[PDB]
Motif scaffolding. Sequence first.
Motif, short mmCIF file in Angstrom:
data_model
loop_
_atom_site.label_atom_id
_atom_site.label_comp_id
_atom_site.label_asym_id
_atom_site.label_seq_id
_atom_site.Cartn_x
_atom_site.Cartn_y
_atom_site.Cartn_z
N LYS A 1 -23.34 -52.13 -50.32
CA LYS A 1 -24.27 -52.12 -49.20
C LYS A 1 -23.46 -52.14 -47.90
N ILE A 2 -23.58 -51.08 -47.11
CA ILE A 2 -22.81 -50.92 -45.88
C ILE A 2 -23.78 -50.70 -44.73
N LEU A 3 -23.59 -51.44 -43.64
CA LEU A 3 -24.41 -51.29 -42.46
C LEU A 3 -24.04 -50.01 -41.71
N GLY A 4 -25.00 -49.49 -40.96
CA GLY A 4 -24.79 -48.29 -40.17
C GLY A 4 -24.89 -47.02 -41.00
N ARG B 1 -25.17 -46.47 -47.69
CA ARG B 1 -25.04 -46.70 -46.26
C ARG B 1 -26.41 -46.63 -45.61
N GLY B 2 -26.69 -47.57 -44.72
CA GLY B 2 -27.96 -47.59 -44.01
C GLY B 2 -27.83 -48.30 -42.68
N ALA B 3 -28.74 -47.95 -41.77
CA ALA B 3 -28.71 -48.53 -40.44
C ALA B 3 -29.32 -49.93 -40.42
N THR B 4 -30.42 -50.14 -41.13
CA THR B 4 -31.11 -51.42 -41.15
C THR B 4 -30.65 -52.23 -42.35
N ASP B 5 -30.34 -53.51 -42.12
CA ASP B 5 -29.92 -54.39 -43.21
C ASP B 5 -31.04 -54.60 -44.22
N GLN B 6 -32.29 -54.58 -43.77
CA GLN B 6 -33.42 -54.72 -44.69
C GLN B 6 -33.51 -53.55 -45.66
N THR B 7 -33.00 -52.38 -45.28
CA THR B 7 -33.02 -51.23 -46.18
C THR B 7 -31.97 -51.35 -47.29
N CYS C 1 -36.46 -63.80 -42.49
CA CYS C 1 -37.51 -62.86 -42.87
C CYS C 1 -36.96 -61.91 -43.92
N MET C 2 -37.88 -61.33 -44.69
CA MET C 2 -37.52 -60.35 -45.70
C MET C 2 -38.65 -59.33 -45.81
N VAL C 3 -38.28 -58.07 -45.98
CA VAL C 3 -39.23 -56.97 -46.11
C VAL C 3 -39.08 -56.41 -47.52
N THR C 4 -40.11 -56.61 -48.35
CA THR C 4 -40.06 -56.16 -49.73
C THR C 4 -41.42 -55.65 -50.17
N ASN C 5 -41.41 -54.55 -50.92
CA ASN C 5 -42.63 -54.01 -51.51
C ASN C 5 -43.00 -54.76 -52.79
N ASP C 6 -42.00 -55.05 -53.63
CA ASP C 6 -42.26 -55.66 -54.92
C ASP C 6 -42.89 -57.04 -54.76
N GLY C 7 -43.92 -57.31 -55.56
CA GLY C 7 -44.61 -58.58 -55.51
C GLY C 7 -43.87 -59.75 -56.12
#
Lengths: 506, 480, 64, 522
Positions: free
Chosen positions: A183-186, A356-362, A40-46
């Motif tokens: 890109k770093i998790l957490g 740094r972000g908690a969600t990998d999709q971010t 799955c992937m979460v993206t705004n861009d068309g």
Amino acid sequence: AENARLSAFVGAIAVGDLVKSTLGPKGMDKLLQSASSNTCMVTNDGATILKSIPLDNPAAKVLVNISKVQDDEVGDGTTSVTVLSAELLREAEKLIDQSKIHPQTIIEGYRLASAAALDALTKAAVDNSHDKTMFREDLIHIAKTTLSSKILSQDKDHFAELATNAILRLKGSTNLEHIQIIKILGGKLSDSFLDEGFILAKKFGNNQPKRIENAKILIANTTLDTDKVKIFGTKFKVDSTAKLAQLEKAEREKMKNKIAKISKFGINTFINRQLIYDYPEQLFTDLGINSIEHADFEGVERLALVTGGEVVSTFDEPSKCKLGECDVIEEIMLGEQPFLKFSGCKAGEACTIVLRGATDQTLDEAERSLHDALSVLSQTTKETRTVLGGGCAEMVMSKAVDTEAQNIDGKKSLAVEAFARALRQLPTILADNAGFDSSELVSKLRSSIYNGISTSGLDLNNGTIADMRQLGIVESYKLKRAVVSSASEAAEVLLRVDNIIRARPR
Amino acid sequence: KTSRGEIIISNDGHTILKQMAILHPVARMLVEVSAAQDSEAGDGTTSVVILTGALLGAAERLLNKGIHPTIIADSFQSAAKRSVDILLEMCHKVSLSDREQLVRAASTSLSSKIVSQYSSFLAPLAVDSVLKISDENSKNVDLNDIRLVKKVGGTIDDTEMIDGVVLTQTAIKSAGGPTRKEKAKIGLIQFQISPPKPDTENNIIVNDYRQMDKILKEERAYLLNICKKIKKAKCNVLLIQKSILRDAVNDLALHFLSKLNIMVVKDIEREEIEFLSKGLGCKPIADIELFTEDRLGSADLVEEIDSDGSKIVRVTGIRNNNARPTVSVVIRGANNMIIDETERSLHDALCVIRCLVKERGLIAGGGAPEIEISRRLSKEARSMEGVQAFIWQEFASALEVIPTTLAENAGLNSIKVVTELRSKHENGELNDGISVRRSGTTNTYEEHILQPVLVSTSAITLASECVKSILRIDDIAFSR
Amino acid sequence: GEKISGDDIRNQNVLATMAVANVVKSSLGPVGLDKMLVDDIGDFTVTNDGATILSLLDVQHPAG
Amino acid sequence: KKRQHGLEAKKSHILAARSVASIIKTSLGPRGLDKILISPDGEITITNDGATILSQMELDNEIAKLLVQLSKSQDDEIGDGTTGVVVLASALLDQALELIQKGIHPIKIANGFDEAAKLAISKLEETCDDISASNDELFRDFLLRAAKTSLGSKIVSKDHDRFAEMAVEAVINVMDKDRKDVDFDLIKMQGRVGGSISDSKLINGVILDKDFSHPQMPKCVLPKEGSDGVKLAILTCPFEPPKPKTKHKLDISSVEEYQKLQTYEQDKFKEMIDDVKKAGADVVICQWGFDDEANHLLLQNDLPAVRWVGGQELEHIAISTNGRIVPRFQDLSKDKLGTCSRIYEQEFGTTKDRMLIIEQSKETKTVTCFVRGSNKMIVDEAERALHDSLCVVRNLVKDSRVVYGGGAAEVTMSLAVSEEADKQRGIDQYAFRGFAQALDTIPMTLAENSGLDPIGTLSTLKSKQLKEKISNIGVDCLGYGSNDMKELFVVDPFIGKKQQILLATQLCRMILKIDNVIISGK
């Protein structure tokens, strides 16, 4: 007209209605669930949305190619490109069928409207150029316009200082490969750090020191894996294993002679493209030189721009080529896996931004935000003209389109006014995601510009009409011209279809 | 039961969601939540995992109000930031280095599964593991320096942390001549002992029948000359890496080392060599040319413990003391099921103190933080007078779901506990929480019910991040 | 996959373990007798020892 | 047969109707919307009525019978404002789901509702007004104020002035001067499809689908020479040439005996027409057909007649004309003649079938509202809307107390139950408040269809009713602005809200006690 174009109108609008919720800074992100691989992937861009969705209508697949154009040129807010072309197909369902006008005449009405639209974008452009003091300070607010269209907007003020200092370190670099995004998790988005140097996700050797000052870094494309590969179609012809055992062992000393040539450089750090055998790895410990390996292609390329060095294959001359130097190469462990933090680069040739972000999709999605934002900063340096967004630009063009309709008159004015009405539906769709009144906000914005006020605009945060200069909504002329000129010509081809030819599937 | 037939029995939220088959697109992202809880917190997963589905009941009640998801999501962002400040006010002052406090604080995470009966001996092993490996500057304290040895047989009461290098794999045992090794050097061999076999084509021209056995004599002499320099260095312990890759070893290497009384072990992972090199301090030997006495380490005595048929090598004493020592503990259990139960049990205790080193604050859990935060939230939510008043108040009503579940899961009445909580926590002081043994509310300090502040902060952060990702999806589309 | 909750799991687990337990209870005490197992592969072993029998017997429910 | 135990059949059984009752939730109030329901026979019935939809709707779970069983008693008890009441009937089962999660016993949940139900009714008795204390003129003025909010509910509410005088003048004809009486049985509304909806008038009588046979005379004769009500009469026995109905045989031994059988009917043809002509009855209704040879002589003697009239309509004619239908030809007499002011056949369409209309201009026992409309679907919907108005006036007769409508009743009793819950304490404090919490969902649901903030309006109600005890402040359904119901003439019967809420509470007590569901085939 009826059976010729049927799914080309409603089918394209139904595609734009799915991404309608994705348009605007107050919009939301769509989930893309692939039927294969269970990913799955979460993206705004068309660009990713329209690519992975099955499209039965050939006209919908054409909207993917025009989306890829705005993906590379702009990349942010590309949803309104296909939506604006969908409104032109809705008005074409009437003027061509109801009003009974030939499609080419409707296209010609949009052709004269496209020429009048370019005149409204150039005259309304604001010139910000020359002195870079107030210019760079304005880039903080100018970037915030297209910076975050996502639900991540809480990171706006945080990434505003990082994105501004990113181009400051580049000092006019227009290449997007000179910037490093990590890109770093957490963690949180507010925990993003920006330092001068590069941070690698690899590590040092076993006995390599954790802190080395005034280290000289040198990379190379060679292969230390084992022995020597020589040429193709070789073999060893010996009488017994007495000579065979020497040939394998001597080449370990022959590679040491190449490492002895490395010691003539006096470098405190070595980086290899491929894997390194344990014996040449231990020889780097005796000389006190760090080792980095397992770089497929861009591994050595990204570090060459930061250190400003050069790939040396031969190791022959400790005079020419390049020698890079970093103040502090110390290994700094961030998160789980240990990272290699470089600092005190020889020059400002490159820069690195750590996220740094908690969600990998971010991490994957916000990477496109800073990647597109730096492209905007490079366009504001080249193109000196900027405009005002936030729904105001569509009503300003509508004033010029309605003005040209009075000069042309005739029956083409129905197609010219429909182009203006199509420009009126974009802020309606833009304000549809916020959930506020369309008739109230559009009427106040449309009538204010006819009264001579071009500084107004739609404010979806407070639900009223506010000044776009005070809220910091600014769009460059390169971004505005690329979207309008492409979207106007995108539907121009879709209106030329008088027949549908379906080939036999393979 | 996985697709390959692996049976895993545990209450761990991260383990269950790992192998769980989910056909719902959004619910598949809930596995990432449990993955972040193990990386950030990593302790008390059974208690933390409830935050994954706790806010689902509060988000469903807000859908009927017609409030835009961004307003609901942004309200949870500010409510999470205010919840962190509430936890920082009630924290307890805890010193970095102590004895009874580390045993009392970790005992909450030590007791989950029935294996907590043997946790009396696990507390000295968990505290001393961090006591040996740590820094007074509050560093990251990587858990990779503590290795868990899995051995079948025995009981948890036989689990003891070894003060020196330990080897899980045994020797070839074919010769098995020496029964012990003491006062001998322990080397690290990164290469392998085999007759030369280059990767390229090898053609050996043999013009005489005597050259055949001569090649055999050369293979015996070339491989023994390596052992001659090892015998000259007085190294009776050799560690070889994984032998199934390329060169492996011949059958004549046993008689060479057995005559010299040198013990050899193979099939060692490359990652294990890096772990053993830190504690032992022995410089690895990548070839016979670099082999010398300065790179070799030393030890007082090396004893091989044989229990229930399983043999394990234990090294006592360290010659050269470095700045990066390593420790290890041998887990003894009846079957791999109990070993896996102790595996996740020891992961919690290591993460508790690790969060105490980074953040010395400590707060009493077990129902205390849920009611205290909800009291300071809904009270301030009424002063908002807007959309934030009807959200944070409902979010505060979702904080009592955890003690409601803890009461029903313990058999006690939910309202009867909440009534005691709401009455006591109204004014409130500290330490008041749910007691499962006494069936009521009492001091959690004496009942060994606690939780680090960094864990509670990372738990509510990932819980607030979970609802953000759920509300981030406005539509479900099936792509190709 | 197939997931069932409630007492249905614990009921099917006890009835499965009790069914295979009543087979080996005939060997209890000095008056016990050996039994034969049919492996369908051509091999058979007649013994009262539960260590080998439970290892040879195919376990239906994973709780067994 | 499936095995369901525990929370399986104790929750999803209630959750079933919870999702079913949420369908009609959008039809609550005059702001509601209609629905389409296809019958199993293929016909389509379009109405927003909660009782009409659930009656013909075929569902799966057996809880649907519990919702229909309640509506059967509501029609004979209140049956007023069905679209409004049907939504709140299922609102009591939604709150019980939250008390189960809290650990309250299901029977303790049911028993806690009846405790707070008697206290909520006593609070509503404080703000009720007595309409019967005034005269007959002010009582009819109170009916006009009530007919605006009460009568008008469903579609055709566009123009409510045409049906306003229909419901008011209907109960004026049949009523007691002391204002204690009701008869809804003799009032039947038979409508037709034609003209416009604004053409509805007041015509007391019945509308017969059968016209005057033998189209050899005038369609209608308005006056009568004998006056005295045109002398209406109805023959109970079928009209045929007299012959034994039992099995019999005829023996003809001569030609003269066969000739006498010819003059047999010929003598009876003149005997039947002269007995009717002697009585001078103009209107003679034959229940089953008539004789072909007598189809002329009736016009020759000026005796309009009809054929194939249902027995149900014959009962309304005899009671309206104050006459008695003639059981036997020999029993025919002038004492059984009825009284009919005017009788005529409506033109209706171009040809179609002319509808015979019997009308009594003076006071009569059978009251009927003349109804015509363009849409065929609105016929059954507009009739049943005005059929409930017969019970609306009945609630104002039997119960002289009237309360202000607009959802202000549930808000008034909400503050009382909240205070009464603190007296019992224990575990019933949250149980009694939960009963009032379920009633608080009614005001929030009213503002849902209108687009108004549910809580923002509800918060003003309790804040306004705290300073002043008057209940005139209530939820605004139609968007009238200020929430005062006294200026808007919004009133609801006291016994209407009383029984419909009480009977729903008494039924939900046995519903929450369901544990296992056993279904067997018929």
